[PDB]
Amino acid sequence: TLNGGITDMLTELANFEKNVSQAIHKYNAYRKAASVIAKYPHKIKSGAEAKKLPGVGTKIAEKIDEFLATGKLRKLEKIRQDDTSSSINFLTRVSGIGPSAARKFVDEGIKTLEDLRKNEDKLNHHQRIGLKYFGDFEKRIPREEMLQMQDIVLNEVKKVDSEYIATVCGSFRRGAESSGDMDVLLTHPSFTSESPKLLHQVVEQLQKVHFITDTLSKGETKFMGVCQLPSDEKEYPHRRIDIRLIPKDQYYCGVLYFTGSDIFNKNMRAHALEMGFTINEYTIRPLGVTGVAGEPLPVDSEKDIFDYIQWKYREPKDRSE
DNA sequence: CCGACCGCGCATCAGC
DNA sequence: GCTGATGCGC
DNA sequence: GTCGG
Ligand SMILES: */O=C1\[N]C([N])=NC2=C1N=[C]N2[C]1[C][C]([O])[C]([C]OP([O])(=O)OP([O])(=O)C(F)(F)P([O])([O])=O)O1
Ligand code: NA
Ligand code: NA
User: Fold this and answer.
1) How far apart are the CA of A93 and the centre of ligand 3, in A?
2) Parallel, antiparallel, or unpaired for β A178-179 and A182-187?
3) Which CATH architecture does the domain made up of A83-139 adopt?
4) H or E stretch including A218?
5) How far is the CA of A125 from the C1' of C9 (A)?
6) How many CB atoms neighbour CB A286 within 10 A?
7) Footprint on protein of nucleic strand B, Cβ below 7 A
8) Ligand 2 midpoint to CA A54 (Å)
9) Is the CB of A286 under 7 A from strand C?
10) How far is CA A270 from each of CA A36, A252, A265, A307, rounded to the nearest angstrom?
11) Which nucleotide is closest to A36, CA to C1'?
């Protein structure tokens, strides 16, 4: 939190690029930037200092200098008071409104949530569901509600076919104390890369125990919707839940992948070169000395995959970067 | 100077 | 009605 | 906006 005033400044700037300017790369520059700065362990004293870091450059080093000397960014203040632009930026928080719809809406004077409630005839399904839950969807998820949720997802999934195999990945599988959503990955033997309605029946069971309350999108391998835990007391906030059906020969590659960590899984691609392997969500192999990657291996355990790329076991629970 | 910067499932929209 | 494109979430 | 060829 040493340079929190700085990283907030860049995260603000990042959001406006994505949401108003629609400059996705500029958005990511500021993110990268606000990330490395959020790990620098000294109170940054100048833009020059900062520019020593990777992904801070000139325009940002001068935005820090102005920040450190005056406490503000004139472009930031001006944009915060700009009605059009602030309202665009805001609406995008509603799930299913990205930069495009938020722009369209603010053109026709729909600039607040209250306005979104006045005009359902204009929101697609996903966006209504987003509107309805806008508050809950910004809450985080205690680890203990996740285990309460995990115990439900595993119970029903098994109660529909004991030969299912399902894991809850994300920051929750890394031991963390809170989660944003819940990401479940699902497999069944009767379906490999060369291969029924395996995902639908799992969704239908969790609607039948009334665990899943809405659907944002559903297909034959991905489901994105809404769940909630039961209850005398106050009802729990409705949560985001995603279910992905993966093949068996690729499950543990995607489990590994979606478990992470983010900061970690990519460290194995600067290390998928000294052992020289192609590690993506599905497949894996060695590469050619001058080119093409081979024909993917077998996988059956998780860390069969760090065997193949010279590392020992690594349980998710005990490491980040 | 000058292009790269992640790419994949699903819902929904142009454009036939 | 079909298909390729674009928006969205992540 | 920053990096790297
Ligand atoms: O743009 C992305 N591209 C990509 N190939 N993968 C990806 C992108 N965003 C996220 N992800 C991966 C990694 C991530 O772990 C999962 C699911 O996204 P989620 O659930 O929103 O992130 P997370 O790690 O679980 C979290 F944000 F830390 P949470 O949910 O605990 O707050 O897919
Ligand atoms: Na730099
Ligand atoms: Na949104």
Assistant:
1) 4
2) unpaired
3) Orthogonal Bundle (1.10)
4) strand A212-218
5) 14
6) 15
7) A 25, 28-29, 124-126, 217-222
8) 5
9) no
10) 18, 20, 10, 16
11) D2
Residue among A6, A57, A54, A58 at smallest CA distance from A34: A6
Q: Determine whether the annotation assigns residue A180 to a binding site.
A: yes
Record the tokens describing residue A54, joined without a space. 């990777």
Residues of A designated as active site: 63
Residue type, A193: S
Inter-residue contact A227 to A238 (CB < 8 Å): yes
Q: Is the CB of A270 under 7 A from strand D?
A: no
Cis peptide before A261 (omega within 30 of 0): yes
- Could you check whether the bond before residue A95 is cis, i.e. omega within 30 degrees of 0? no
> Is A254 close to ligand 1, i.e. is its CB under 6 Å away?
no
Task: Reduce the DSSP state of residue A82 to 3 states and report it.
Answer: coil
Experimental approach was X-ray
Q: Which atom of ligand 1 is nearest to the CA of A260?
A: 15
Q: Which value in Å is the resolution of this experimental model?
A: 2.6
Query: Taking the domains of chain A in order of start, what are their residue ranges?
Result: 1-82, 83-139, 140-257, 258-320
The residues, any chain, with a CB within 8 Å of residue A303's CB and separated by 6 or more, are: A256, A311, A312, A313, A314
The answer to whether A187 and A245 are in contact (CB under 8 A) is yes
Å separating the CA of residue A49 from the C1' of nucleotide B9: 43
Domain range A1-82, its CATH number among 3.40.50.1820, 3.40.50.2300, 1.10.150.110, 3.30.230.70: 1.10.150.110
Could you give phi then psi for residue A113, rounded to 5 degrees? -65, -50
